[PDB]
Structures are given as structure tokens and as C-alpha cells.
Amino acid sequence: DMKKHGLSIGINRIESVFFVTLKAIGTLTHEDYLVITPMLEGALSQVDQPKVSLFLDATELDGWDLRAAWDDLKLGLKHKSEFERVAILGNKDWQEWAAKIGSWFIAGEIKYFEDEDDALKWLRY
Amino acid sequence: MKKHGLSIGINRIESVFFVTLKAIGTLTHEDYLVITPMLEGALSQVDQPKVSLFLDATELDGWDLRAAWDDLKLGLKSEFERVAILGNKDWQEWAAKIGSWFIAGEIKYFEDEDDALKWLRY
């Protein structure tokens, strides 16, 4: 009834360093892809930092439909830059998107976490 | 490891899409220069003809008054029906100020999330 579904993209500064943030939540549909991804793309294309990394909060993501457009989503940076690091935060138990959601990104390194503090420390230092 | 910044999104509750924006920490002029182009890039892609905005300012401490944040105007390509601002502080500190970034039929301040969201989808 009140369950939320979708994603948000942002920029956060932590200890003087800016990073891109992404939060995915609920169960994503085809309609959701059509409505939400142009906005994510529009946002990410305006990020122009010397080096930049990404924090992906997927703790509240259920997943998406079999072979949905979400499998092939690509989120890239303003001048074809790659993310230095991408920290993917999940939960204790494996979820259907675990081995798939990383492919949205071109990254120097992708690391998976169950604790936000650890994820942020790895990104920052 | 205190976070300072803003995120923008689209969420759906049942069958209704709404724009969502969360602001956190104390925003500086450098933050403005880095975040506002992305915020504007996101908003220019919202095509839904009837749409509202949920603004989560629960973790917002404020911004530098000499920074461009005071003057920010966010909009659609073309207006929000409703903007629901969620926060804990006396409204006169920042709620009216951040509310003024938007043009909308109605702009309302809430301390309860459930009530804010219900009001947006009515």
C-alpha cells in the first residue's frame, strides 16, 4: 500500500570528498524503467569531477522482472570518465540482483558490502 | 563521516509516480556548484504531466546564506501539483526557504512521513 518503488541519484560530500550516491528500492517494473532511467541518465551526465566514485544503497531493493530492461542498464559519466570505485551495499543474504547490478557501471573496482560505514570508509580512503 | 548533499529521484507508491528529493547536512557554495547541475539534469527529464514532489529535509541542517542556494529555483520542463516538505525543525529556520525553490499549486510542511505521502497522492 505505502511501499515505495524506484531510485534516487545524488551527490554527497564526506570528509571534503564528493561522491555520487544511488539508492534503489522495491520491485522495479518495465514501466518503472521507462519513467525513472531517463532521469538517472540526465543527472549522471552532469557530474564532472576529476575523480569520482559511487555509493549504491540497494539494502531496500527487491529486484526486477526476468530479463527486464534493468539487466542492461548502463549508467556512465559526463565525459566518458569511469568511476574509480563503486561500493554496492546489500544485506546479509544474497539477493537476485547481486551478480547483475554491478554491470550498470564501468568502475576501476567494485566492492560489495553489508554495512554502510565500511562501504563509505572504503570509498573515502 | 557526516554526509552533506542532495539526492533526486522518482518513487512509485501503488500506481502513482512522484518526484523525491532528500537534502542532508549543511550545504556550501562548492556543494551548489557540484550538485545543482545534476539536480537540473534530472528534473529536465521528468515528463509526467501531473506530478508532485516529496522533499525529505529531516536530516537537513541548513546552507551558507551567501551561497547560491538561497536563490535556487527548481522546475519542470510544467509545474508540480503539490510539494510536501518533511522536517523536524521550526518551519521558519529552513522549510519556508527550501519551499520557495519550487512553484506548485500547494506547498505544505509535515513532521510525519505517512501524512506527507498521503497528502501528495490525494
Residue numbers in the entry:
A (entry chain A): 2 to 126
B (entry chain B): 3 to 79, 82 to 126
Authors' own words:
The crystal structures of the proteins encoded by the YP_749275.1 and YP_001095227.1 genes from Shewanella frigidimarina and S. loihica, respectively, have been determined at 1.8 and 2.25 Å resolution, respectively. These proteins are members of a novel family of bacterial proteins that adopt the α/β SpoIIAA-like fold found in STAS and CRAL-TRIO domains.
